[PDB]
């Protein structure tokens, strides 16, 4: 939007004083933290230290991006004055970023450039903790990485003045954010049963653009991200973003096993809200089956993939257990969800032999481990390791 309500007011009134964001040191961001909290709090690290992140040399610019992914390359740009207008490439767009503000004709924003394809990849690496819990590196069969939700690394490039209205990222994913150059202002809203309600009825009634959802909730936090900060958003959070100055950001969306109920909670919103099967998370329910099969294999040492995939996994490798309540309830959710899908679209992936045997093997594993000691679960390392 930015239509009816004064965004300018929303930016300076000092009233979105909620205290949701937790400030901490990257060293403190280990897997145990996740098992202890379930990545339920948005995090803001000021020093990239301790996070195991790697980013280009600070002077890196927009074209240094468009050189790498090269010009003539089509990019999904959109005029933040309505929607969609992806009629341009890196060539045509770096020629816009450097266009002095006043001359600047339209208002553009590029929030969806996922470069993992391009060389830039081994030039930009996310915090190692995220490499431990990510459902792609650790869940999806390795030899397949389209056929692997290529939605890990992203390059955000915004121009002073753009505003992305309130939304919850796709597939109930979490997201890490590193402002390389510039700054961003966020409006954080918690995925309270109540807020998620208001949020859906808002997506239905039209997202009016006349209502600033931030004012609709009892408490909301407007935070400011500076150059150097790393920002972690947990699944489900409803946020809105505004760019005070031309910025360059590097981040990515991931799924993990400690907040499954919320992730699914969001898919169903995306379902009821008839979201276009375009912006849907790639192979969602298919990733789910691999999740179960990894859990049942890492714990029961009973493989449920096919012989073929089993060989592939073994070849590549050669080149009791106490769960948190988070995973236990989460597994319970994947099981009920998958079981409630009409037979035709249960989206059983390709590497899985018998599905029902799996589900049965999980209902059994979910009852045997029903009593896990929260203390003992805190192993410091995810049980699903070695994709």
Instruction: By CB under 5 A, name the binding residues for Fe ion.
Output: 169
Q: Decide whether 169 or 353 has the Cβ nearer to Fe ion.
A: 169
Query: Is residue 164 marked as binding?
Result: yes
Backbone dihedral angles phi then psi of residue 204, each to the nearest 5 degrees: -80, -65
Q: How do beta strands 154-158 and 88-89 pair?
A: unpaired
- CA-CA distance, 176 to 317, in Å (whole number)? 29
CB of 215 to Fe ion, least distance (A): 19
Contact status, residue 38 vs residue 326, Cβ threshold 8 Å: yes
- The number of CA neighbours under 13 Å toward the Cβ of 248 is 18
Q: Does residue 184 have a known ligand-binding role? A: yes
Known binding residue 304? Answer is no
Q: Is 118 annotated as a binding residue?
A: no
Q: How far is the CB of 164 from Fe ion (least distance, A)?
A: 7
For Fe ion, which is the closer residue by CB, 169 or 355? Answer: 169
Nearer to Fe ion, 137 or 169 (CB): 169
Beta carbon of residue 170, minimum distance to Fe ion (angstroms, whole number): 9
Q: Which is nearer to Fe ion, 169 or 329 (CB)?
A: 169
Distance CA 194, CA 206 (A): 19
Q: For residue 140, report the phi and psi dihedrals to the nearest 5 degrees.
A: -65, 135
Minimum gap (Å) between residue 249 Cβ and Fe ion: 11
Q: Is 180 annotated as a binding residue?
A: no
Between 42 and 382, whose beta carbon lies closer to Fe ion? 42
Q: How far is the CB of 42 from Fe ion (least distance, A)?
A: 12
Q: Show the tokens assigned to 372.
A: 């896990």
Q: Taking each helix axis from N to C terminus, what angle separates 325-339 and 284-300, rounded to the nearest 10 degrees?
A: 130
d(CA 101, CA 278): 32
Nearer to Fe ion, 190 or 351 (CB): 190
Q: In angstroms, what is the minimal distance from the CB of 239 to Fe ion?
A: 6
Token pair listed for 344: 């035709």
Supply the minimum distance, in Å, between the C-beta of residue 308 and Fe ion. Answer: 38
Q: At what angle do helices 355-368 and 284-300 cross, to 10 degrees?
A: 60
Q: Which residue is nearest to Fe ion (CB)?
A: 169
**For residues 35 and 195, which CB has a smaller minimum distance to Fe ion in the complex?**
195
157 exposure class (CB count in 10 Å sphere: 0-12, 13-18, 19+): buried
Specify the residue for token string 């009593």: 371
Answer whether 126's CB lies under 8 Å from 133's CB.
Answer: no
Q: Using CA atoms, how far apart are residues 31 and 36, in angstroms rounded to an integer?
A: 8
Positions at the binding site: 164, 167, 169, 184, 239
Positions at the binding site for Fe cation: 167, 169, 239
Positions at the binding site for substrate: 164, 184
């Amino acid at each position: 939007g930015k239509r009816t309500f004064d965004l300018e007011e929303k930016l300076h009134t000092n009233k979105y004083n909620a205290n949701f964001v937790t400030f901490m040191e990257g060293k403190d961001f280990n897997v145990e933290y996740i098992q202890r909290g379930g990545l339920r709090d948005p995090l803001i690290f000021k020093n990239s230290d301790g996070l195991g992140i790697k980013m280009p040399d600070p002077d890196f610019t927009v074209n240094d991006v468009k050189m790498c992914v090269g010009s003539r390359r089509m990019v999904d740009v959109m005029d933040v004055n309505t929607q969609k207008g992806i009629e341009m490439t890196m060539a045509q767009w770096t020629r816009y970023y450097e266009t002095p503000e006043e001359e600047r004709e339209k208002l553009y924003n590029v929030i969806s450039l996922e470069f993992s394809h391009t060389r830039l990849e081994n030039m930009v690496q996310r915090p190692s903790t995220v490499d431990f819990i990510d459902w792609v590196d650790n869940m999806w069969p390795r030899h397949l990485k389209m056929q692997y939700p290529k939605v890990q690394k992203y390059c955000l490039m915004s121009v002073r003045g753009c505003y992305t209205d309130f939304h919850v990222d796709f597939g109930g994913t979490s997201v890490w954010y590193h402002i390389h150059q510039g700054g961003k202002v966020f409006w954080l809203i918690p995925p309270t049963a109540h807020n998620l309600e208001l949020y859906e009825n808002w997506l239905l009634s039209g997202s009016q653009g006349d209502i600033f959802l931030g004012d609709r909730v009892s408490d909301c936090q407007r935070i400011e991200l500076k150059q150097g900060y790393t920002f972690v958003i947990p699944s489900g959070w409803i946020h809105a973003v505004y760019t005070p100055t031309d910025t360059l950001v590097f981040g990515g969306n991931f799924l993990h096993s400690f907040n499954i109920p919320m992730q699914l909670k969001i898919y169903n919103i995306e379902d009821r809200t008839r979201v276009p099967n375009k912006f849907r998370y790639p192979f969602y329910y298919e990733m789910c089956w691999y999740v179960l099969e990894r859990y049942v294999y890492c714990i029961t040492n009973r493989s449920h993939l096919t012989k073929e995939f089993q060989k592939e996994s073994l070849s590549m490798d050669l080149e009791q257990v106490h769960l948190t309540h988070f995973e236990l309830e989460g597994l319970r959710c994947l099981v009920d969800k998958l079981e409630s899908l009409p037979l035709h679209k249960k989206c059983v992936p390709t590497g899985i032999e018998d599905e029902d045997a799996l589900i049965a093997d999980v209902k059994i594993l979910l009852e045997e481990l029903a009593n896990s000691d929260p203390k003992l679960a805190l192993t410091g390392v995810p049980i699903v390791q070695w994709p």
